[PDB]
Enzyme design. Structure first.
Site, PDB file in Angstrom:
ATOM      1  N   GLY A   1       1.201   5.138   1.829  1.00 14.24           N
ATOM      2  CA  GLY A   1       0.850   5.880   3.022  1.00 14.24           C
ATOM      3  C   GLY A   1       1.104   7.367   2.903  1.00 14.24           C
ATOM      4  N   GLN A   2       0.938   8.089   4.013  1.00 14.25           N
ATOM      5  CA  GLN A   2       1.186   9.527   4.004  1.00 14.25           C
ATOM      6  C   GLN A   2       2.674   9.834   3.902  1.00 14.25           C
ATOM      7  OE1 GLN A   2      -1.077  12.088   6.820  1.00 14.25           O
ATOM      8  NE2 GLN A   2      -2.319  10.264   7.232  1.00 14.25           N
TER       9      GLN A   2
ATOM     10  N   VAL B   1       4.775   0.702   1.387  1.00 10.47           N
ATOM     11  CA  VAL B   1       5.075  -0.549   2.076  1.00 10.47           C
ATOM     12  C   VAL B   1       5.070  -1.687   1.066  1.00 10.47           C
ATOM     13  CG1 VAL B   1       4.513  -2.017   4.035  1.00 10.47           C
ATOM     14  CG2 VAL B   1       3.930   0.407   4.099  1.00 10.47           C
TER      15      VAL B   1
ATOM     16  N   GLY C   1       0.813  -1.197   0.000  1.00  7.86           N
ATOM     17  CA  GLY C   1       0.000   0.000   0.000  1.00  7.86           C
ATOM     18  C   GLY C   1       0.850   1.251   0.000  1.00  7.86           C
TER      19      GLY C   1
ATOM     20  N   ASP D   1      -2.316   7.180  18.034  1.00  6.90           N
ATOM     21  CA  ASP D   1      -2.933   6.936  16.734  1.00  6.90           C
ATOM     22  C   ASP D   1      -3.694   5.622  16.750  1.00  6.90           C
ATOM     23  OD1 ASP D   1      -3.493   8.065  14.253  1.00  6.90           O
ATOM     24  OD2 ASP D   1      -1.960   6.862  13.238  1.00  6.90           O
TER      25      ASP D   1
HETATM   26  C1  LIG Z   1       4.037  -2.496  10.167  1.00  5.10           C
HETATM   27  C2  LIG Z   1       3.624  -2.225   8.720  1.00  5.10           C
HETATM   28  C3  LIG Z   1       4.832  -1.833   7.877  1.00  5.10           C
HETATM   29  C4  LIG Z   1       2.909  -3.430   8.119  1.00  5.10           C
HETATM   30  C5  LIG Z   1       3.061  -4.755   8.495  1.00  5.10           C
HETATM   31  N1  LIG Z   1       2.269  -5.487   7.727  1.00  5.10           N
HETATM   32  N2  LIG Z   1       1.590  -4.641   6.836  1.00  5.10           N
HETATM   33  C6  LIG Z   1       0.684  -4.945   5.870  1.00  5.10           C
HETATM   34  N3  LIG Z   1       0.277  -6.325   5.642  1.00  5.10           N
HETATM   35  C7  LIG Z   1      -0.938  -6.678   4.918  1.00  5.10           C
HETATM   36  C8  LIG Z   1      -2.192  -5.952   5.425  1.00  5.10           C
HETATM   37  C9  LIG Z   1      -3.208  -5.649   4.536  1.00  5.10           C
HETATM   38  C10 LIG Z   1      -4.344  -4.989   4.975  1.00  5.10           C
HETATM   39  C11 LIG Z   1      -4.465  -4.629   6.306  1.00  5.10           C
HETATM   40  C12 LIG Z   1      -3.450  -4.926   7.197  1.00  5.10           C
HETATM   41  C13 LIG Z   1      -2.314  -5.588   6.759  1.00  5.10           C
HETATM   42  C14 LIG Z   1       0.157  -3.911   5.109  1.00  5.10           C
HETATM   43  C15 LIG Z   1       0.576  -2.609   5.374  1.00  5.10           C
HETATM   44  N4  LIG Z   1       0.031  -1.522   4.586  1.00  5.10           N
HETATM   45  C16 LIG Z   1       0.243  -0.110   4.995  1.00  5.10           C
HETATM   46  C17 LIG Z   1       0.277   0.720   3.772  1.00  5.10           C
HETATM   47  C18 LIG Z   1       0.295   2.169   4.083  1.00  5.10           C
HETATM   48  C19 LIG Z   1      -0.872   2.560   4.998  1.00  5.10           C
HETATM   49  N5  LIG Z   1      -0.901   1.746   6.234  1.00  5.10           N
HETATM   50  C20 LIG Z   1      -0.895   0.294   5.946  1.00  5.10           C
HETATM   51  N6  LIG Z   1       1.465  -2.377   6.331  1.00  5.10           N
HETATM   52  C21 LIG Z   1       1.961  -3.412   7.054  1.00  5.10           C
END
Ligand SMILES: CC(C)c1cnn2c(NCc3ccccc3)cc(N[C@H]3CCCNC3)nc12
Lengths: 65, 279, 286
Positions: free
Chosen positions: C12-13, C17, C10, C113
Site C-alpha cells: 500500500g501507500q 499487508v 499486497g 475514502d
Molecule cells: C483491513 C485490511 C488490512 C485487509 C483485510 N483483508 N485484506 C485483504 N484480503 C484479501 C483481499 C484481496 C483482494 C481484495 C480484497 C481483499 C487484502 C488486503 N490488501 C491491501 C493491500 C494494500 C492495499 N489495500 C489492500 N487488505 C486486507
C-alpha cells in the site's frame, strides 16, 4: 424475505437528545453560530455542531462504573 | 461517543481505592524488578503521586505555551495519557519528564493537530542538541506510551459536554438567565477537577455538569429544577440521588486535593534522579 | 508475537499487508499518522459493517495493526465480468454499506475514502468499510478538513469545488458513485483530472443552478461551467426501477444538505421493496 428499517439502539446512559431536524424549531440553533455560506455549500450546518454538543453533554451522565 | 468509548469501559474506575491499588502494584513490581536485577532510594507511592502531580503541572505548562496553539482537546488528551500511564507505571522506571513530552506528542498526533517534529521539539526550552536528544527519547517512548495506554487513544474531555450543557441551559432553562455567566468559574472548577483523579473516576458529562452546578452554587443560583424538571429525573428518583452524590463526591475530591510542595518536590526529584542513575 | 506470517496480501501507500493466524496484519516524524488514525478510530467503533481492529503492536517506530481477514472487496466484484449482479445483490451491498455508514455517522466520523476497493467482503458475505486512514471526525466547526480527499472518480462536487467544511454528503456521493458502478460495471465518472471530473459530472447529471445548489458559487474553487442539461437518469441506468432511480437521485443531489443521509437512504422505499436484499451467504464471490 424483505428489509425493514429499525433505528440503531445504543444506550447513551443519559437524557434524551432532541432530534437533529427539530433543533431549529425548539430554539437550540439560536445558541450556536450559524454555518457560513461556504459551509452550507459544502453541506456543513450549525445543526450538526449543536447536535454533537448536546449528545456529548448528555452522554453517560447517569452511568456508574 | 463516550457511552460506548474505551474511556468508559476501561479507564473509568470504581473508586480511589482501586486507583491506589494499581499504583501501589506498580511500585511493588518496580521494586521486585530492581531487586531481582542486582533501601531509601525507592520512593513510596505517595512520593510518586507528588512527583506525578508536579509533572502534570509541568505538562500543562508545556502545552499552554506550545506554538502553534494546541487545541484544548489535545491538552486534555495528553494529561489523560499521563494519568493513565502512571496508573500502571512507576516514575522510577520511566521518567515523567520524558513521558509527559511523549504524551503531548502522541496527543498532538491523535487529535489531528498537525505539527512537525522539529516544531514540537523546538517548543522545548533546550539547546538544539538537547532538543534533538529529547526528540530521540520521545520517539523511543512513543510506542511504549501507546502500549501502556492499551492502544486507547481517543480521550473524551469534559469541554464539549460543557458546551452542550451551556446550549441546553440557554434553550430549556429560562430561570437561569444568561448561563454564560457560569462559564469562567465553571472553567476554573473544571481545571481544579482535572488536577484530581476524577477524570479516571467519572464521566466527562458528569464532570462538566458538576463544574456548572458548582459555578451556579458559588453565585447563589440554584438549579435543582434543571435536573428535576428539564432533565426529567422524575420517574427515577434514585437516578437523581445518584447524580447528586456523584457531584458531591467530585466536590469532595476537589476539596481534599493538596498541591505538591516545592521543597518536597525537590527532595523527591533528587531521589528520582538517583533512582534513574541505575536500575 | 502470537501471529505467524502466512501470505503476502499486497503493498500500500503507507503499509504492506500479510495474512496470519485468520487475521490480516498491516505493517523523525515517529509512528505513522495513518496507522494512528486507524487505531484510534477503530478502537472506538464496534459494528458488523465496520472493519474490526483485533490488535495492534510494533517495535520502536514501526507499528502493525491486526484486523480480521477479508475475502475480497467490491472492486473485484464489479470488475469480475463473470458475476451477474442482480438487483438483490446490489440492494444487499448498498444496505450493508449504508448500515455501516449510518453507524459511523452517528458516532460523528466520515470515512472520506469510500470506493469499491475499500468495501471489503468476508467469506460470510458481510460488507465492512475499511481503510480508515483518511477517516476523520465531523460535527465540530473548529476541525479543518482537506478537500483533496476521496478518490477522484468518487469525489463529491462540493469537494471538487474545494469545500473545506463538509458533512456526510461526501460519503453519500461516494456511495452514489459506487451504486452507479455496481449498476454499470464501469466507473461512473472516470475523470482524468479535477476539471475533467467536474465536466463529466455536469455532462452526465446536468450543470447545477442556483436553485439546485443554493451556495454553489461560494465554494473556494468554484469553476463557472457551461449549462449542460445532463442525461436523464432512466437513460443512464436503463434497467433501474423508479425506487432505485429515486435513491440514485437522492444520492446525486448536487446540494449536499439535500443529499440523502445514510438513515434517510435506509428509510427509502427501495430497500423495503421487493425483492429483498440477498443474505450474505448468497452474495456473489469471485
Ligand atoms: C483491513 C485490511 C488490512 C485487509 C483485510 N483483508 N485484506 C485483504 N484480503 C484479501 C483481499 C484481496 C483482494 C481484495 C480484497 C481483499 C487484502 C488486503 N490488501 C491491501 C493491500 C494494500 C492495499 N489495500 C489492500 N487488505 C486486507
Amino acid at each position: 424475505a424483505l428489509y425493514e428499517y429499525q433505528p440503531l439502539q445504543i444506550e447513551t446512559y443519559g437524557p434524551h437528545v432532541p432530534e437533529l431536524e427539530m433543533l431549529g424549531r425548539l430554539g437550540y440553533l439560536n445558541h450556536v453560530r450559524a454555518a457560513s455560506p461556504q459551509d452550507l455549500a459544502g453541506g456543513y450546518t450549525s445543526s450538526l455542531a449543536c447536535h454533537r454538543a448536546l449528545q456529548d453533554a448528555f452522554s453517560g451522565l447517569f452511568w456508574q462504573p | 461517543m463516550y457511552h460506548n468509548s474505551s474511556q468508559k469501559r476501561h479507564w473509568t474506575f470504581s473508586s480511589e481505592e482501586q486507583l491506589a491499588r494499581l499504583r501501589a502494584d506498580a511500585n511493588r513490581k518496580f521494586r521486585c524488578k530492581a531487586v531481582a536485577n542486582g533501601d531509601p532510594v525507592f520512593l513510596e507511592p505517595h512520593e510518586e503521586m507528588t512527583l506525578c502531580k508536579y509533572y502534570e503541572k509541568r505538562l500543562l505548562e508545556f502545552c499552554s505555551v506550545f506554538k502553534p496553539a494546541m487545541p484544548r482537546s489535545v491538552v486534555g488528551t495528553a494529561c489523560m495519557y499521563f494519568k493513565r500511564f502512571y496508573l500502571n507505571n512507576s516514575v522510577m522506571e520511566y521518567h515523567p519528564r520524558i513521558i509527559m513530552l511523549t504524551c503531548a506528542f502522541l496527543a498532538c498526533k491523535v487529535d489531528e493537530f498537525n505539527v512537525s517534529s522539529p516544531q514540537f521539539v523546538g517548543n522545548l526550552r533546550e539547546s538544539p542538541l538537547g532538543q534533538e536528544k529529547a526528540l530521540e527519547q520521545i520517539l523511543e517512548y512513543e510506542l511504549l506510551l501507546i502500549q501502556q495506554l492499551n492502544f486507547h487513544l481517543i480521550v473524551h474531555n469534559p469541554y464539549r459536554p460543557f458546551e452542550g450543557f451551556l446550549i441546553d441551559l440557554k434553550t430549556r432553562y429560562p430561570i437561569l438567565e444568561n448561563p454564560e455567566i457560569l462559564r469562567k468559574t465553571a472553567d476554573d472548577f473544571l481545571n481544579r477537577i482535572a488536577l484530581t483523579d476524577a477524570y479516571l473516576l467519572y464521566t466527562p458529562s458528569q464532570i462538566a455538569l458538576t463544574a456548572i452546578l458548582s459555578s451556579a452554587s458559588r453565585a447563589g443560583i440554584t438549579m435543582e429544577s434543571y435536573l428535576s424538571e428539564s432533565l426529567m429525573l422524575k420517574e427515577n428518583r434514585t437516578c437523581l440521588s445518584q447524580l447528586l452524590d456523584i457531584m458531591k463526591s467530585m466536590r469532595n475530591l476537589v476539596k481534599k486535593y493538596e498541591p505538591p510542595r516545592s521543597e518536597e518536590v525537590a527532595v523527591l526529584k533528587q531521589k528520582l534522579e538517583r533512582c534513574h542513575s541505575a536500575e | 508475537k502470537r501471529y505467524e506470517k502466512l501470505d503476502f496480501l499486497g503493498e500500500g501507500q503507507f503499509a504492506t499487508v500479510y495474512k496470519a493466524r485468520i487475521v490480516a496484519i498491516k505493517k523523525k516524524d515517529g509512528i505513522n499518522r495513518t496507522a494512528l488514525r486507524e487505531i484510534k478510530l477503530l478502537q472506538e467503533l464496534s459494528h458488523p459493517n465496520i472493519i474490526g481492529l483485533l490488535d495492534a503492536f510494533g517495535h520502536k517506530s514501526n507499528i502493525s495493526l491486526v484486523f480480521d481477514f477479508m475475502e475480497t472487496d467490491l472492486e473485484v466484484i464489479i470488475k469480475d465480468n463473470s458475476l451477474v449482479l442482480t438487483p438483490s445483490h446490489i440492494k444487499a451491498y448498498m444496505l450493508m454499506t449504508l448500515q455501516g455508514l449510518e453507524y459511523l455517522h452517528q458516532h460523528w466520523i466520515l470515512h472520506r475514502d469510500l470506493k469499491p476497493n475499500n468495501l471489503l467482503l468476508d467469506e460470510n458475505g458481510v460488507l465492512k468499510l475499511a481503510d480508515f486512514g483518511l477517516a476523520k471526525s465531523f460535527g465540530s466547526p473548529n476541525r479543518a478538513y482537506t478537500h483533496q480527499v476521496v478518490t477522484r472518480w468518487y469525489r463529491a462536487p462540493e469537494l471538487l469545488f474545494g469545500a473545506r467544511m463538509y458533512g456526510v454528503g461526501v460519503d453519500m456521493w461516494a456511495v452514489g458513485c459506487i451504486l452507479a458502478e455496481l449498476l454499470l460495471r464501469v466507473p461512473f465518472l472516470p475523470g482524468d483530472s479535477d476539471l475533467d471530473q467536474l465536466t463529466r459530472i455536469f455532462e452526465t447529471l446536468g450543470t447545477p443552478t442556483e436553485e439546485q445548489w443554493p451556495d454553489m458559487c461560494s465554494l473556494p474553487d468554484y469553476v463557472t461551467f457551461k449549462s449542460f442539461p445532463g442525461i436523464p437518469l432512466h437513460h443512464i441506468f436503463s434497467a433501474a426501477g423508479d425506487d432505485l432511480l429515486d435513491l440514485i437521485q437522492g444520492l446525486f443531489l448536487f446540494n449536499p444538505c439535500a443529499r440523502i443521509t445514510a438513515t434517510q437512504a435506509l428509510k427509502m422505499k427501495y430497500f423495503s421493496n421487493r425483492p429483498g436484499p440477498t443474505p450474505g451467504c448468497q452474495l456473489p464471490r469471485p
